[PDB]
Design an enzyme around this catalytic site. Structure first.
Site, PDB file in Angstrom:
ATOM      1  N   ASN C 167       0.975  -1.234   0.015  1.00  0.00           N
ATOM      2  CA  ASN C 167       0.238  -0.558   0.006  1.00  0.00           C
ATOM      3  C   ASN C 167       0.410   1.436   0.098  1.00  0.00           C
ATOM      4  OD1 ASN C 167      -2.620   1.876   0.689  1.00  0.00           O
ATOM      5  ND2 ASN C 167      -1.059   2.304   2.772  1.00  0.00           N
ATOM      6  N   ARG C 172       3.489   6.018  -2.623  1.00  0.00           N
ATOM      7  CA  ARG C 172       4.942   7.181  -2.454  1.00  0.00           C
ATOM      8  C   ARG C 172       5.650   6.582  -2.990  1.00  0.00           C
ATOM      9  NH1 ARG C 172       2.586  10.352   1.460  1.00  0.00           N
ATOM     10  NH2 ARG C 172       1.520   9.897   2.831  1.00  0.00           N
TER      11      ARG C 172
HETATM   12  C1  LIG Z   1       0.017  12.256  -2.793  1.00  0.00           C
HETATM   13  C2  LIG Z   1      -0.709  12.097  -1.957  1.00  0.00           C
HETATM   14  C3  LIG Z   1      -0.782  13.543  -0.953  1.00  0.00           C
HETATM   15  C4  LIG Z   1      -0.931  13.913   0.188  1.00  0.00           C
HETATM   16  C5  LIG Z   1      -1.429  12.383   0.883  1.00  0.00           C
HETATM   17  C6  LIG Z   1      -1.229  10.888   0.678  1.00  0.00           C
HETATM   18  C7  LIG Z   1      -0.350  10.806  -0.683  1.00  0.00           C
HETATM   19  C8  LIG Z   1       0.195   9.931  -1.116  1.00  0.00           C
HETATM   20  N1  LIG Z   1      -2.082  12.178   2.317  1.00  0.00           N
HETATM   21  C9  LIG Z   1      -2.210  10.732   3.525  1.00  0.00           C
HETATM   22  C10 LIG Z   1      -3.069  10.376   3.125  1.00  0.00           C
HETATM   23  O1  LIG Z   1      -4.935  10.830   3.656  1.00  0.00           O
HETATM   24  C11 LIG Z   1      -3.464   8.941   4.007  1.00  0.00           C
HETATM   25  O2  LIG Z   1      -3.007   9.325   5.659  1.00  0.00           O
HETATM   26  C12 LIG Z   1      -2.144   7.775   3.391  1.00  0.00           C
HETATM   27  O3  LIG Z   1      -1.084   8.354   2.411  1.00  0.00           O
HETATM   28  C13 LIG Z   1      -2.760   6.921   3.056  1.00  0.00           C
HETATM   29  O4  LIG Z   1      -2.527   6.117   2.987  1.00  0.00           O
HETATM   30  P1  LIG Z   1      -3.843   4.732   3.873  1.00  0.00           P
HETATM   31  O5  LIG Z   1      -4.199   4.019   2.855  1.00  0.00           O
HETATM   32  O6  LIG Z   1      -5.103   5.802   4.778  1.00  0.00           O
HETATM   33  O7  LIG Z   1      -2.930   3.615   4.741  1.00  0.00           O
HETATM   34  P2  LIG Z   1      -2.565   2.951   6.441  1.00  0.00           P
HETATM   35  O8  LIG Z   1      -1.059   2.505   6.415  1.00  0.00           O
HETATM   36  O9  LIG Z   1      -2.966   3.961   7.408  1.00  0.00           O
HETATM   37  O10 LIG Z   1      -3.792   2.350   6.034  1.00  0.00           O
HETATM   38  C14 LIG Z   1      -3.473   0.462   5.210  1.00  0.00           C
HETATM   39  C15 LIG Z   1      -5.364   0.524   4.566  1.00  0.00           C
HETATM   40  O11 LIG Z   1      -5.547  -0.050   6.255  1.00  0.00           O
HETATM   41  C16 LIG Z   1      -7.305   0.665   5.945  1.00  0.00           C
HETATM   42  N2  LIG Z   1      -7.310   1.533   7.109  1.00  0.00           N
HETATM   43  C17 LIG Z   1      -6.553   2.159   8.252  1.00  0.00           C
HETATM   44  N3  LIG Z   1      -7.217   2.611   9.203  1.00  0.00           N
HETATM   45  C18 LIG Z   1      -8.140   2.823   8.889  1.00  0.00           C
HETATM   46  C19 LIG Z   1      -9.220   3.546   9.550  1.00  0.00           C
HETATM   47  N4  LIG Z   1      -9.015   4.106  10.607  1.00  0.00           N
HETATM   48  N5  LIG Z   1     -10.521   3.284   8.119  1.00  0.00           N
HETATM   49  C20 LIG Z   1     -10.227   2.837   7.110  1.00  0.00           C
HETATM   50  N6  LIG Z   1      -9.112   2.444   6.942  1.00  0.00           N
HETATM   51  C21 LIG Z   1      -8.759   2.308   7.374  1.00  0.00           C
HETATM   52  C22 LIG Z   1      -7.471   1.433   4.670  1.00  0.00           C
HETATM   53  O12 LIG Z   1      -8.231   0.994   3.683  1.00  0.00           O
HETATM   54  C23 LIG Z   1      -5.615   1.787   4.018  1.00  0.00           C
HETATM   55  O13 LIG Z   1      -5.727   1.071   2.425  1.00  0.00           O
HETATM   56  C24 LIG Z   1      -2.430  13.453   2.855  1.00  0.00           C
HETATM   57  N7  LIG Z   1      -3.376  13.864   4.269  1.00  0.00           N
HETATM   58  C25 LIG Z   1      -3.593  14.839   4.469  1.00  0.00           C
HETATM   59  O14 LIG Z   1      -4.189  15.057   5.395  1.00  0.00           O
HETATM   60  N8  LIG Z   1      -4.156  15.686   3.255  1.00  0.00           N
HETATM   61  C26 LIG Z   1      -3.860  15.872   2.450  1.00  0.00           C
HETATM   62  O15 LIG Z   1      -3.504  16.823   1.627  1.00  0.00           O
HETATM   63  C27 LIG Z   1      -2.776  14.649   1.752  1.00  0.00           C
HETATM   64  N9  LIG Z   1      -1.896  14.378   0.665  1.00  0.00           N
HETATM   65  C28 LIG Z   1      -0.828  15.355   0.276  1.00  0.00           C
HETATM   66  O16 LIG Z   1       0.361  15.752   1.166  1.00  0.00           O
END
Ligand SMILES: Cc1cc2c(cc1C)N(C[C@H](O)[C@H](O)[C@H](O)COP(=O)(O)OP(=O)(O)OC[C@H]1O[C@@H](n3cnc4c(N)ncnc43)[C@H](O)[C@@H]1O)c1[nH]c(=O)[nH]c(=O)c1N2C=O
Ligand SMILES: Cc1cc2c(cc1C)N(C[C@H](O)[C@H](O)[C@H](O)COP(=O)(O)OP(=O)(O)OC[C@H]1O[C@@H](n3cnc4c(N)ncnc43)[C@H](O)[C@@H]1O)c1[nH]c(=O)[nH]c(=O)c1N2C=O
Ligand SMILES: Cc1cc2c(cc1C)N(C[C@H](O)[C@H](O)[C@H](O)COP(=O)(O)OP(=O)(O)OC[C@H]1O[C@@H](n3cnc4c(N)ncnc43)[C@H](O)[C@@H]1O)c1[nH]c(=O)[nH]c(=O)c1N2C=O
Ligand SMILES: Cc1cc2c(cc1C)N(C[C@H](O)[C@H](O)[C@H](O)COP(=O)(O)OP(=O)(O)OC[C@H]1O[C@@H](n3cnc4c(N)ncnc43)[C@H](O)[C@@H]1O)c1[nH]c(=O)[nH]c(=O)c1N2
Lengths: 216, 216, 217, 210
Positions: C167, C172
């Protein structure tokens, strides 16, 4: 409260909900307070895989499902569960008896009505054995182990829209057992009613399953 | 909306909430009212470590805090976050300048007022360097790396009562940095206002920290 | 121990690993109760059909030294285990990320890219000197450190399973993510490829959503 | 390592990552005597995150009713025998008369054991009859009792494993899962003796391990 009946004695009831489509809009823009521009954001977040704003919409359901269905459901770890204790809680002792129509498509040596009869036969025998052990002094936790997997259970399910959308890709699909598919269709119906924009966008850009794009 | 101001330019604002103390009662009994019996159950679940019914009470907050506070907060994985993009948002640049009263207790060679002045001096120099790079054509994602860790950020925090009670145990305690203690006190205040029985039971049977049993 | 250097002073070091490609095979093979070619065919089947749970049985431990702005983006990955240096107590080296003029190639700037590099070095020296002056005068570490820039280097331990790692690589190791974290994700992909070659190959072939891993070797 | 549980069940250690020092290395970012002293310090002061860096993989064969209680532990990785696609072996948990010792029963404890065997044979024969007649596995299996043995893979870190031991290796949990939890504790003690000992001394909430 929205209540959709599933199978012979089961249901899916909406207990509570937090937020709507705008809860995901507020979280994506990060500010505490245009319809077309807001709905366009929902479609943008969905089509580009920006799933985190949808975690801010939470649902609480009350489900009455047979143990074999609950076992498949409870595999979804990113959620909150609270079930009836088989060791202490006074269960109703209801069982899922499939109708002959469940066996439609499969060619069977015995009639589908005989399959329904054989399932009823063994649940009655198992339940009578359970009561006989309970009456003779056997503790609930030991006597209950003889009860079949089709026995009905009740639980509370607190899940966010993101984890609910994952459950829909996996359980509201032909590869999942028909019994859980039915329960997921009720979850999709309640989800559509509360978050119409997020549901529509989900079916259009993120939905991986098949039955939701075929069934209305 | 409940809004508690923290530090010189920060805050904690309650965006939304799902459920109350009875949401935990309904989830523990597994059923969709007796005040004394309902409050007695909250105390029973709390003293015996039955924490899962409290996961059915969910909160959404809007927090404005320095990046060093957000870094400590975001370590709490059992929650949902949505923060301002430093790479794209036309953000309001504000910095946490500690008052001389923050250095009370520590013996310093220079006056506490001079520490406050030296912090203001370097944040102005860092911010001016940032604007100069931004004006000259340097992309936001590269120019921002020069900004100090006291730079204020805004985020949306969706957390259930169980994970919120873990946060309170750890952050609303003397061992945690004074800045996050302040933010946790505002969280505890909004939690007490919405779930008074759960907050009272938590302080009575589960709370491991110190400042919440001393500060009203 | 595999160690890949990232940026001017950073790295990604493999501390420990549990299992390999056959760990995911053993975990999947328990479902449908019951050979290199047959076990590699299963990895590809699990990957192309979205059977992701067997890959959670392969776990990695990394030691990463990255600028705080990179760590902030990394630590957003909640399905993992973290342990970082305490800014309040730990004895930091006090190293900062100074981008080379080549980082600004493509962007049209009024000032030369070399002047941008100089201005970044200038302000990190000023901030670090202010920090030491406060530390020497008796200001506690937790208060004095707040003046330090976001390019400062931090160290952490990352325990992540192959599913959550895949993931991370999706998000990333992609052009939409900041160039700084893309570099760190490429080293993660390199260590992942070295330990789990069948899973990594299947991942790029059927599950990988990003772009840079299908272009860069 | 393989510990047999109940009449036909087991707990087998598949793999492990790290030891007591894995938690020391992860904490020191923030000498045998000094390292063991750190383990006891982290445990007695509630510094639980360094213990997440020690991971275990188990192979468990347990009845469905035990697995249902186990699978409630969400901070872990699971992989179980399908049922919808697997071949159902005649493996069910039949409690021995000794399980009913303490309880006063109208019928002898040996008759309880016989009645459990009787109804599992009837339910298993009904299952095979439906399977032979063309009923798909996913539908025919719903008649099988909750004492039916299943197999699964459990990947869990030391922190979540210590939560499992506080809850399942305790008198308030069902006697059947207590047995499995004792095997989880035995394997944990063998691989992480310092962590287990400090856990027993400062963090352990249950009763049966003490
Ligand atoms: C190109 C880009 C731009 C931005 C961002 C990222 C990127 C790549 N991100 C980060 C993402 O939001 C996120 O945190 C992470 O990258 C994905 O990270 P993520 O996909 O949420 O990964 P994880 O490790 O938390 O969890 C793995 C999996 O577990 C599940 N999960 C885990 N906890 C959960 C729960 N509580 N509820 C539901 N499902 C949940 C879900 O299916 C997820 O795919 C931003 N975040 C933010 O707040 N504002 C922004 O403007 C931005 N943006 C500007 O930088
Ligand atoms: C058609 C079909 C057949 C089968 C099964 C399912 C279906 C649809 N499933 C269940 C799935 O494996 C899975 O549990 C479920 O879909 C929840 O699916 P799931 O995706 O694991 O749901 P989640 O709620 O646990 O978590 C939501 C998201 O959070 C992340 N996540 C959560 N915990 C994590 C962690 N620890 N590490 C890494 N990432 C983690 C991950 O990105 C995930 O998408 C089987 N499981 C099994 O063991 N053997 C089998 O033969 C089968 N198979 C027979 O029924
Ligand atoms: C003696 C006894 C009796 C019963 C039960 C148990 C026992 C021992 N349990 C099951 C427990 O809830 C179980 O320990 C839990 O599910 C896993 O127990 P658990 O402790 O929740 O384990 P976990 O692996 O899910 O997660 C480990 C830690 O992770 C955190 N966490 C994880 N997900 C979270 C989230 N979403 N939100 C907040 N925090 C979350 C939390 O801090 C938790 O401690 C019952 N449950 C129920 O519904 N009705 C009942 O009558 C009973 N009761 C009879 O069966
Ligand atoms: C005073 C003080 C000082 C420090 C720190 C905190 C405090 C309060 N921390 C941060 C600390 O290690 C921790 O990350 C946060 O306090 C969050 O705590 P939880 O993991 O319990 O919450 P979180 O919200 O992340 O999870 C809540 C619960 O879920 C469970 N959980 C979640 N994910 C899990 C997983 N993958 N495996 C097992 N269980 C899991 C646990 O039971 C946990 O209690 C720290 N950190 C640091 O790196 N260096 C330092 O020096 C310090 N110093």
């Amino acid at each position: 409260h929205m209540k959709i009946d599933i199978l012979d004695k089961g249901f899916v009831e909406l207990v509570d909900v937090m937020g709507n489509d705008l809860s995901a809009v507020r979280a994506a823009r990060v500010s505490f307070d245009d319809e077309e521009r807001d709905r366009h954001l929902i479609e943008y977040l969905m089509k580009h895989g920006h799933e985190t704003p949808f975690e801010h919409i939470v649902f609480t359901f009350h489900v009455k499902a047979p143990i074999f269905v609950a076992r498949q459901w409870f595999r979804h770890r990113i959620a909150s569960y609270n079930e009836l204790s088989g060791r202490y809680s006074k269960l109703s002792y209801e069982f899922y008896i499939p109708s002959p129509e469940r066996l439609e498509g499969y060619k069977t040596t015995i009639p589908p009505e005989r399959v329904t009869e054989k399932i009823s036969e063994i649940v009655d025998k198992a339940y009578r054995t359970y009561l006989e052990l309970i009456e003779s002094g056997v503790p609930r936790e030991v006597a209950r182990i003889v009860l079949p997997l089709n026995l009905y259970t009740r639980f509370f399910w607190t899940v966010n829209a993101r984890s609910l959308m994952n459950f829909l890709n996996l359980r509201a699909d032909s590869h999942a057992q028909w019994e859980i598919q039915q329960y997921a269709l009720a979850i999709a119906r309640i989800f559509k009613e509360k978050c119409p924009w997020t549901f529509e966008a989900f079916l259009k850009y993120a939905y991986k399953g098949d039955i939701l794009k075929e069934v209305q």
